[PDB]
RNA sequence: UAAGUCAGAAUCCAUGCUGGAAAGCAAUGUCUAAGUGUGAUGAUAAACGAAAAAAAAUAAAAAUUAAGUUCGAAAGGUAGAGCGGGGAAGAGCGAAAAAGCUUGACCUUAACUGCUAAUCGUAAUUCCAAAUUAUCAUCUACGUAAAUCUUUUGUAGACGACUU
RNA sequence: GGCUCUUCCUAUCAUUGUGAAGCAGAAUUCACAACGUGUCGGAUUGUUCACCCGCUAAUAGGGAACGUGAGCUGGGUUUAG
RNA sequence: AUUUUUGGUAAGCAGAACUGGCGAUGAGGGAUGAACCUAACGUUGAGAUAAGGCGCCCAAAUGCACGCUCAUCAGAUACCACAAAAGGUGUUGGUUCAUACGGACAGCAGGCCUG
RNA sequence: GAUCGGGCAGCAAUGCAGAUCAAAAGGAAAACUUCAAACUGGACUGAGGGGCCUAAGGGCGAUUUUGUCAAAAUGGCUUCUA
């Protein structure tokens, strides 16, 4: 919670858990970004959340149809309804807790670099029996007509080609800076550490 | 979408400056100056190679010629027409020629 | 918050059930008499709710009232040895929206303190029974020869093995607590 | 110069005060010390002095100001502890990070 | 209640063999390559002794017991399909309007015309690995062959079905397509 | 796949509990998420499944409801202190336990330490 | 049908269409006189490592139960030293919100050496960084592009607005 | 009460896709997903209703202060002749 | 209002009995709200509570253990905002009668029996 | 010594190993309840301004030391913010 600013790759994540949890950390202070939001979780069949999703479609302002709720159909903006739900919005202080949240689908310029972080407890894998029912956001935002899916993936994959160049790269010198520390020298402090209590 | 980039030719015909001006004759007239003086055949080239390399959805900037009318309006006016062909090199070939 | 001595350490595990032996007798309490003396065992989670259970089923089974006789005594009844695995039966009757009912349910527990707790918690989930409607009949300690339940002998081989298959995240003291992470777990 | 070199204090958050749905005690702060997780690890810090620095217009050529208090309590079972202030902390505070120093150290 | 372990076993014959890598089901035989993916239940498939292959399910529960058995059935027919394929046998049936038929060389395609007397075209697409085919001698029929239970029981389907009638009493009418033999051997 | 089971007489470490970061073995389940518990440094007890983790041990020796001390005895000849001694895990564990202790002049020198393993590796020669 | 699969509606979502002051974003034309002008005072729901880039999989594997990690971390000085750190120009690459990565004139710094620390008197923020931007005052430049009103059009019009 | 206009309900009149029949066809009846779209012109009556003459895919039943008088109208109802 | 009550198909209807209460009364809890639950009020600090809570809005457990539940109309609790007669090879318990290697159930077989 | 079984053996007849109950003779220990003795860290508070009093020990209800403070500093006022 005191890190400058947390970064959560949302995929895999449980909808209204992960919801709770940024929500919280926004209170107290947390400043956060949430990416890969089309990659979030929620528990039901495809076909129950997409009734629940036009369940909401349905509601809107009767005379004016142009105030009022904007039906969000982007896997951001879903998330984005979510945690303002769990926050006091509407007060000056819960406006800053939103103010601090920002959050996207895929993972866009500024944060290829910045170490995306999960909460635990937000796992799909973590919180659902393995064998019950559930969707990916962008499925929803898919029924919904939420145009970009088939773009991310492609982004996505193209990020993915920047990691393995990185990674490789950080593997093979970082093997020869391992098997130089092996060296005579080196050896010797080596050794002094470990007695130290490595 | 979003307009990645915009390549001029060196010929702009005073009309079509037009449609940047509100009175054309009291002003001296600077539109394009630069892309004149500063006009680079190479550096144009390298814009629609990346158009080539970046790009989804090509479109012509088109000019309508008033005065071969006889209309009070003189001014020209200034379109985008998106081409529609098989591949975006072609595409983008065919945008050069025209 | 008061301990039977064969509870666990950690208080979660198990339920407050003890097992009483309460015992009393006619109120006239003739001296040089030989006197009736009326004895139960009954399961409570205090003295008093033992004497309590005792007078329900005693006012229930004979004629007397508690202005009519004398507790002697209330003494916990404990389990030989918590070393070993032992199949109870338990004989029920309890109080459902319609009707009363007789059952008869089996536990692997290391007491029959375990047997019943276990009972409870169960007849609560799966028929929503309240504590205070329970009657137990009968228990005993089974024998092998005499379990019933396919549940429970569902346990009985050495080659016994569960993988486990999946591993929730739990930190070790709060002192670990983290809500969110720099890498994702595993399960396994 | 880059930074100051050694801060001598451990990062609190101030969360609000102490309170119930319809009614708080100003009098109480509570905040939650870093990496300070449950009430053992709290307790530490009982009689610990706690600031509160925050900026402004010049007042004696210091551009800073002040509130000093101490941790008193564990409040609830993760980590959380109140504070009094001498000056019940100002409300917009709540966002923020309060220095818990270790100065009290006593035999 | 909970189920611990459950269990079934899929024998394999000779010319057999069999590759279960994350779930994925890969079997090859004398008449080809099947693959199928079954990400979606959370079952353990043993790696295949070119005796046997075992699936387990643990700590399950009465739906999830299902999953197992029906898997392996699966493969059963994984397994039996590319040893000897499935062959299907459909007899056109018509009581007065003769239905026209038109096979393509590929196996791939039908054409149905003429059914009931509709001026309309029926075009039915068979599923991969499927051939429609049909002889001189056949009186009336259409076949269907494959190494795919699935995909050729499908392609059937969807034959039978373009042809259902509509708006008035089936029971009379009772012109259609219909599958007359199922599961042959080759 | 499956290879590690929880099996009678299995050995298993005791996290989440009063026991933690301590080894044992299991006599018996009890029901499908409790076991029985022994070893050298742990009373007899019953633990949900949950709070255990199965360590790769597995000591065909051990018999079902096996008393305490024989256990200890099977336990002793098997070398689970030698053995898990060894492992990653314990060796982890026990650097872990070393950093623990450590004063202001400990850190310091680790410090001074890590700038030279840094610093000196152009010593090629 | 329980997992798993096909078909399938005047339905739903899209496509097409009209709005679009969403206190949204992009590409492009020209201009912004004079300086990478300075001075003082200020504000920013939060500076004192507020440190940290694999990808995927959770019924996987030959094998590793926790970022319960790893890296950094010496005096908020001076004089030397110089492991190391940062980078002009230009030339390379880089587009999901182009954020930056390479090379590089050069700029700089840690061990070690000498001075300097004490009288900030047993505590009272350790007031210094970075990214932004307000106000007042001033030095140089007294220019450049464009718009509007007073005209004009009637493809528009209650008036403003709009086409020209 | 009508006129005008908008929107909602579904206990669907018609239109779409279907299941059922004592479904041969034609017509009809029962049921399902379902209002998305449509549901008219005149006699007599102040009429709501009712009844008739007609066209029509159909001429469904309702709500919205028994929708709607600073929107009309004023025939009815309820001052004073 | 609890309990008891009469007329009435019934009513947030009309009448009666005992104790309260609301009116004349705030505080916390039932989101909300006269008569419910705790609890009765001078100004103020501390501590520990009742009623009710402790995933977020929200103080306090995403505590630790049990049983049961998948809804193409889940469920989420006093006074409270309603549901019945009637049905289900969904799933889990329990009740009472039955079968089984002197080989059952079922299927395939074969001539009630038999592999 | 006696039973038992969710063992290894053994083709069977039988043995090895268990677990439960347990004779006389010995050992060594845990949990709970009650009642006692004592250590160390915090928070809030200091009402009153005596020489009187005694169970001979004390009681009668905070003292000590140190630092800072001349400048709008502290308290307040107007306006605004949470
Ligand atoms: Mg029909
Ligand atoms: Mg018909
Ligand atoms: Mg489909
Ligand atoms: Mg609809
Ligand atoms: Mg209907
Ligand atoms: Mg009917
Ligand atoms: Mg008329
Ligand atoms: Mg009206
Ligand atoms: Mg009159
Ligand atoms: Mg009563
Ligand atoms: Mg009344
Ligand atoms: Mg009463
Ligand atoms: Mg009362
Ligand atoms: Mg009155
Ligand atoms: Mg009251
Ligand atoms: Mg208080
Ligand atoms: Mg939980
Ligand atoms: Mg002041």
Known sequence: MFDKLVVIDAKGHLLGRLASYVAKELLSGQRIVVVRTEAINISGSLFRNRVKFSEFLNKWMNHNPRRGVQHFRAPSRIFWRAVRGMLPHKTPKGAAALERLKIFEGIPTPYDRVKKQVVVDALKVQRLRNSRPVCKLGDLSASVGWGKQTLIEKLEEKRRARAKTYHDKKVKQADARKKELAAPALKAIKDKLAQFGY | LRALTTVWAKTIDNNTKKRFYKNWANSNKKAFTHHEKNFDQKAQDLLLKRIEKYCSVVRVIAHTNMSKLNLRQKKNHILEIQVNGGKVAEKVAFAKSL | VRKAAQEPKDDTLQMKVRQYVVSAARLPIEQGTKPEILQMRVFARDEVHAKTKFWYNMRKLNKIKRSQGRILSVNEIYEKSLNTVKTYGIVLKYQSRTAIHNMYKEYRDVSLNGAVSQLIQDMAGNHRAQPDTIQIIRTATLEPKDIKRPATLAMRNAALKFPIVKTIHRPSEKKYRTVYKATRPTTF | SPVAPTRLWVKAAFTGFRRSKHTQNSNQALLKLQNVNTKEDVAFYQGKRVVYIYKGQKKNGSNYRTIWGRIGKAHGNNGVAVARFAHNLPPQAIGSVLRVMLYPNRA | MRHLLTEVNVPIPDKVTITAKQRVVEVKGPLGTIKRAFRYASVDIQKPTADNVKLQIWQASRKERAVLQSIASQIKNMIRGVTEGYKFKMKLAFAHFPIQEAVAKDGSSIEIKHFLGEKRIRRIQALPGVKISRKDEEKNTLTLQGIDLNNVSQTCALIHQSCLVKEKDIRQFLDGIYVSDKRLAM | ?125
């Not at chain 6, 796949?1 to 970061?21: E, L």
């Not at chain 6, 983790?53 to 305490?68: A, G, P, S, W, Y």
């Open chain 6, 1 to 125: 796949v499956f290879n590690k089971f929880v099996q009678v007489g299995r050995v298993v470490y005791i996290n989440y509990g009063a026991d933690k970061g301590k080894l044992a073995v299991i006599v018996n389940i009890i029901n499908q998420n409790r076991i029985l518990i022994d070893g050298e440094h742990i009373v007899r007890q019953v633990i949900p499944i949950r709070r255990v983790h199965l360590t790769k041990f597995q000591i065909d020796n051990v018999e079902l409801n096996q008393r305490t001390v024989l256990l200890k005895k099977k336990i002793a000849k098997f070398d689970l202190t030698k053995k898990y001694a060894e492992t990653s895990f314990a060796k982890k564990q026990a650097i872990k336990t070393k950093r623990a202790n450590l004063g202001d002049f400990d850190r310091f020198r680790v410090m001074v330490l890590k700038k030279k393993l840094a610093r000196t590796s152009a010593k090629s020669k």
